[PDB]
Amino acid sequence: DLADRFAELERRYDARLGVYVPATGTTAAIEYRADERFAFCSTFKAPLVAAVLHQNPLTHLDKLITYTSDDIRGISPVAQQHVQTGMTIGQLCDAAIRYSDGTAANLLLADLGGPGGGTAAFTGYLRSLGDTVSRLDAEENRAPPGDERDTTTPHAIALVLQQLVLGNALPPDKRALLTDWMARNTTGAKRIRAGFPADWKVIDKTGTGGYGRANDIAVVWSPTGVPYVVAVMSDRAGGGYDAEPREALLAEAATCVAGVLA
Ligand SMILES: [N+]
Ligand SMILES: [N+]
């Protein structure tokens, strides 16, 4: 019983774990706490890039955005080295996904515009994909576990990623950009990627936070090219606001999923 094995991971890592793998043409869905709420953390930056792509012609990727050192907010590996030159919308999409760049995310939200610095518009994009539960409220706080702001569920975000990467939410040219940025992500080697054999292809977007939060959302392809969406979320609310996030938990959960899918 796979659910028994997920529960053992919860006890061993003193953590709460959520998993959703949508059913496919030849597999049943995998689900564990799939409708419980977990913080987005940085995983929202993947659908955020999709929302910007959706709303604009591809020429928009060449638009140069200027900003100052005081605009550097959240962990921003790329943006904080390009204050003087600025960054194009396309470079900001790249940084937001592949380096979780918080400033890039803030600028892409500002590009959507509207109240809340773009967070209302982003949430509306998720509504348009049929996601009735997720919400984004703040820009790049260690939100308490009970707070519903800035949360999703494994079920909800997996079905969002399913439509974006494997469905028709985006035209093929915009779909290919999103897929490529996730494929060359730099932050995910020790999470879902670490749970799948080397001949599976893995694209992903991570998130990490207080209360021991560690997330990874991925699309994987078997060695013969069959794709599956895998969403894994975790936290450790009982360990306090500074509980250690555990990448090994996500890797071990992904290993259990890979055993089901192989
Ligand atoms: N949250
Ligand atoms: N913003």
Numbering used by the authors: 29 to 83, 86 to 145, 145A, 145B, 145C, 145D, 146 to 166, 170 to 238, ...
Show the paper's wording.
BlaC is a class A serine β‐lactamase found in Mycobacterium tuberculosis (Wang et al., 2006). The enzymes in this class utilize an active site serine (Ser70) to perform a nucleophilic attack on β‐lactam rings, forming a covalent acyl‐enzyme intermediate that is subsequently hydrolyzed (Fisher & Mobashery, 2009; Strynadka et al., 1992). BlaC can efficiently hydrolyze penicillin antibiotics but has low activity against later‐generation oxyimino‐cephalosporins, such as ceftazidime, due to their bulky C7β aminothiazole‐oxyimino side chain (Sun et al., 2023; Wang et al., 2006). We analyzed the structural changes in mutants of the β‐lactamase BlaC from Mycobacterium tuberculosis obtained via directed evolution for increased ceftazidime hydrolysis activity.
The crystal structures of BlaC variants PD, PDDS, and PDDSH were solved at 1.3, 1.6, and 1.4 Å resolution, respectively. Between these mutants, significant differences are observed in the Ω‐loop. In PDDS (blue), the loss of the negatively charged carboxyl group of Asp172 (to Ala) causes disruption of the low‐barrier H‐bond of D179‐D172, which was shown before to stabilize the Ω‐loop in WT BlaC (Sun et al., 2024). As a consequence, the chain between residues 167 and 172 is only partially ordered, indicating mobility in this region of the Ω‐loop. The initial mutations found in the selection screens are located in or close to the Ω‐loop (P167S, D240G), and also in later rounds such mutations were found (D172A, D176G). Also, two mutations in the gatekeeper loop were found (S104G and I105F). As the name suggests, this loop covers part of the entry to the active site and lies over the Ω‐loop (Feiler et al., 2013), and these mutations further enhance the accessibility of the active site (Poirel et al., 2001; Radojković & Ubbink, 2024; Yi et al., 2012). Some mutations stabilize a single conformation, largely eliminating the peak doubling (D172A), and others stabilize one part of the protein and introduce new peak doubling and, consequently, new conformational states, in other regions (H184R). For one branch of the directed evolution experiment, we managed to obtain crystal structures of the successive mutants, PD, PDDS, and PDDSH, showing the opening and increasing disorder of the Ω‐loop in an otherwise defined protein structure, suggesting minor structural changes.
